[PDB]
Amino acid sequence: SHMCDAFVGTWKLVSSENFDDYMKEVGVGFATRKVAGMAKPNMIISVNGDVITIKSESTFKNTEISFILGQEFDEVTADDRKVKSTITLDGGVLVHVQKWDGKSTTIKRKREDDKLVVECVMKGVTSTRVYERA
């Protein structure tokens, strides 16, 4: 047993708050915001040795990242940003920092009760997205 066991599985989005405003702050344009804001993704998390894989799948976009904690990687986000990402575990929370064009956003993923809560922050704007097991 290990690091991220409680994150592993298949998760479905059940609620969202403030995601449009978060996307505005990130620089997402109108049409992408509308279509992405409609998405109801599933998030599929798996671990094999030191490698964590997170897939996001929706009618908008299917993405997949694989990474080792603490080890930077380049990521193309669903909204087509080219970012440099580092994901760490901080007191049981997965903390994902994305850097691009002098900007930064942080995505935190945590287990709370039977939920996986995703908090996305870009400057003063936070969006909270709640997932439940599929």
Ligand SMILES: S=c1[nH]nc(Cc2ccccc2)c(=S)[nH]1
């Ligand atoms: S929690 C969650 N992760 N990833 C996506 C795709 C996405 C990422 C960044 C900006 C726009 C859309 C969604 S819709 N929800």
